[PDB]
Design a protein around this nucleic acid. Structure first.
Ligand SMILES: [K+]
Ligand SMILES: [K+]
Ligand SMILES: [K+]
Ligand SMILES: [Mg+2]
Ligand SMILES: [Mg+2]
Ligand SMILES: [Mg+2]
Ligand SMILES: [Mg+2]
Ligand SMILES: [Mg+2]
Ligand SMILES: [Mg+2]
Ligand SMILES: [Mg+2]
Ligand SMILES: [Mg+2]
Ligand SMILES: [Mg+2]
Ligand SMILES: [Mg+2]
Ligand SMILES: [Mg+2]
Ligand SMILES: [Mg+2]
Ligand SMILES: [Mg+2]
Ligand SMILES: [Mg+2]
Ligand SMILES: [Mg+2]
Ligand SMILES: [Mg+2]
Ligand SMILES: [Mg+2]
Ligand SMILES: [Mg+2]
Ligand SMILES: [Mg+2]
Lengths: 77, 127, 26, 75, 90
RNA sequence: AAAUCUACGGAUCUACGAAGGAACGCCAAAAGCGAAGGCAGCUCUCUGGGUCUCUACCGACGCUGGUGUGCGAAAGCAUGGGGAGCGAACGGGAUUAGAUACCCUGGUAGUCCAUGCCGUAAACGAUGAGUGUUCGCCCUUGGUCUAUUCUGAUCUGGGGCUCAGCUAACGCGUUAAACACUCCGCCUGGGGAGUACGGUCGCAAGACCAAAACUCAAAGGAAUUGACGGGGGCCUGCACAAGCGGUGGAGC
């Protein structure tokens, strides 16, 4: 594993391996399964799936990862 | 204006199959559903969360179709609470199409019991 | 006494028990 | 553990049920349920590994809290 | 928190004082640990033994999963008034 | 991944009731007790040991200990019961080149109780029992004294860290692998070998004591530098993913 020493805080020891709009996609496919694969009469699910991609365009690759510098510097000082 | 005998939804979430059963207040079964008895799932795997919340969806639609308005949800299983919470909200999804219609659920309960060192469990699997 | 030294004793004991069960059945 | 839902707010009832299953300790025991049989000679090994992990976490939290409380209270 | 002392526990702890012993069970019906009351090990041993004796005698629940929560003085029956609800909201 | 198995004679699921066997969740553990093996639901009976206090008694009555005697996980053996769950042997279904195995499904002996036998374990702290001395710090089990409301002191066992000291190194460190001593057991290069022969014990399985011929010049312990891992973490490559055109087919 990683070399044990000082203080280290993992950038992935939280919920971040979660690529969004999985649940929206499976509800959209549930509509197709119920309504024998027809895009009609559940256009609200299609609107939800498209506003997923608009919000995915809004969000970018984000995390907070400068924590370890602060921990190391303040532990030394 | 308080009534007494609400229907009961039991949701046992085992490891390889989830059972949802709709009973009255004295225990008489009115309808039931399992993972393997769904019309679309065709073999292969059954322990994933999709089989559980699909069974909850199916029972929710079937309970809406028989005109019930007052249910009490009892959940049983040796799993994390996230899966029980997801199964309950999937049942609400089955009853109400857009999460807009009023909640028929009037009570939620967890009925999961542990053996007090009873029988001896089977051996490990050297896979 | 390491495992590499215990394995020689293991094999010798296994062979002796096998021969005892064979020859001692008379 | 039974929780009554008021005014049709299912999310508040589910959060209350989750927190009560947490604080009653039943969630720890419902996760500690075993699928197979473990002998006492393996229960000892698992308890020892648990103890070592706990000691490491105690040292980490002690040092983190000390360096927090040095800075935060006017120093 | 609720203040309990080892001397208080050592004077009150008995399987007939179910009202006092009900401080030391959770909503799941299981026994509270020592570290969240601060009493000594002798006090914890006495509390656990008396709660076990009361459970065998029938005055306290073994477990409360599938049943209502245990408070002193009222019945543990599963009557029709356990699940009273409202209909005027619909 | 499946199949055997089981189910329309109505299974799984749901409520109530009945039977029977084994183990005692939470408390709960670097806790406690025991010479060691070991000992976990609760109430009573009988009993072994231990700790603290005393301006109490007695007066070296002590330590170790060959030959001997007693206790001694588990499996196993004999007689009589019991049998839920698990499960050697064995039947079947899969996997594979084969699979007398790993995986799945049934399941006898056994695991349990009463009375006896055997007397072995990585029975391990891989550290025999005992006595005296050696700088401290932080926790904790059970007491006693003093308190000045929150603490100090002194015994008793259990743990963590360490000055010295010791150690081939790893490490030990007031519960020593430190500074010394008393008594017991054991070792004298590897293989052959805990094997052969003999005696004692056992209903058996086997246990205890325990060689030689021959053969080799090594067999080893700890750590270092590389390499490797169907062990892990962080990266990265027309290697893959997304496309486009070929080669293997024809003639030259
Ligand atoms: K003693
Ligand atoms: K003696
Ligand atoms: K040390
Ligand atoms: Mg040796
Ligand atoms: Mg002891
Ligand atoms: Mg036995
Ligand atoms: Mg018999
Ligand atoms: Mg098997
Ligand atoms: Mg076979
Ligand atoms: Mg079986
Ligand atoms: Mg031996
Ligand atoms: Mg042992
Ligand atoms: Mg001795
Ligand atoms: Mg003390
Ligand atoms: Mg001490
Ligand atoms: Mg030194
Ligand atoms: Mg000493
Ligand atoms: Mg030495
Ligand atoms: Mg031998
Ligand atoms: Mg002989
Ligand atoms: Mg490609
Ligand atoms: Mg060609």
């Amino acid at each position: 594993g990683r070399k044990a020493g000082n203080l280290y805080i993992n950038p992935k020891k939280l919920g971040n391996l979660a690529k969004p709009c999985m649940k929206e996609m499976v509800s959209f496919l549930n509509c197709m399964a119920l309504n024998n694969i027809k895009d009609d009469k559940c256009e609200k699910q299609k609107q939800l799936l498209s506003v997923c991609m608009q919000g995915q365009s809004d969000h970018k690759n984000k995390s907070w990862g400068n924590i370890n510098y602060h921990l190391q510097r303040l532990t030394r000082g | 204006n308080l009534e007494t005998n609400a229907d009961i939804i039991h949701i046992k979430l085992l490891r390889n199959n989830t059972f949802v059963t709709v009973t009255d207040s004295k225990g008489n079964v009115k309808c039931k559903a399992t993972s393997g008895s769904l019309p679309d799932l065709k073999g292969g795997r059954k322990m994933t969360s999709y089989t559980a919340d699909a069974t909850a969806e199916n029972i929710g639609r079937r309970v809406k179709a028989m005109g019930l308005k007052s249910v009490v949800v009892k959940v049983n299983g040796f799993t994390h609470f996230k899966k029980k919470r997801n199964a309950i909200v999937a049942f609400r999804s089955g009853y109400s199409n857009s999460r807009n219609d009023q909640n028929p659920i009037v009570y939620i309960e967890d009925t999961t019991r542990k053996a007090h060192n009873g029988c001896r469990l089977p051996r490990k699997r050297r896979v | 006494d390491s495992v590499k030294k215990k394995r020689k004793k293991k094999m010798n004991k296994h062979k002796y028990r096998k021969l005892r069960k064979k020859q001692g059945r008379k | 553990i039974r929780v009554k839902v008021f005014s049709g707010d299912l999310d508040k009832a589910l959060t209350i049920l989750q927190r009560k299953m947490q604080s009653s300790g039943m969630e720890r025991l419902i996760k500690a349920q075993q699928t197979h049989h473990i002998k006492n000679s393996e229960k000892k090994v698992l308890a020892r590994k648990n103890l070592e992990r706990k000691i490491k976490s105690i040292d980490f939290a002690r040092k983190l809290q000390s360096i927090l409380i040095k800075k935060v209270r006017g120093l | 928190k609720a203040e309990i002392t080892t001397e208080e526990v050592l004077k009150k702890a008995d399987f007939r004082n179910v009202r006092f012993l009900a401080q030391f069970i959770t909503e799941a019906g299981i026994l509270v640990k020592r570290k969240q009351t601060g009493i000594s090990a002798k006090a914890q041993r006495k509390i656990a033994r008396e709660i076990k004796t009361a459970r065998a005698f029938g005055l306290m629940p073994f477990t409360t999963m599938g049943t209502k929560a245990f408070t002193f003085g009222k019945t543990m029956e599963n009557r029709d008034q356990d699940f009273e609800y409202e209909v005027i909201d619909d």
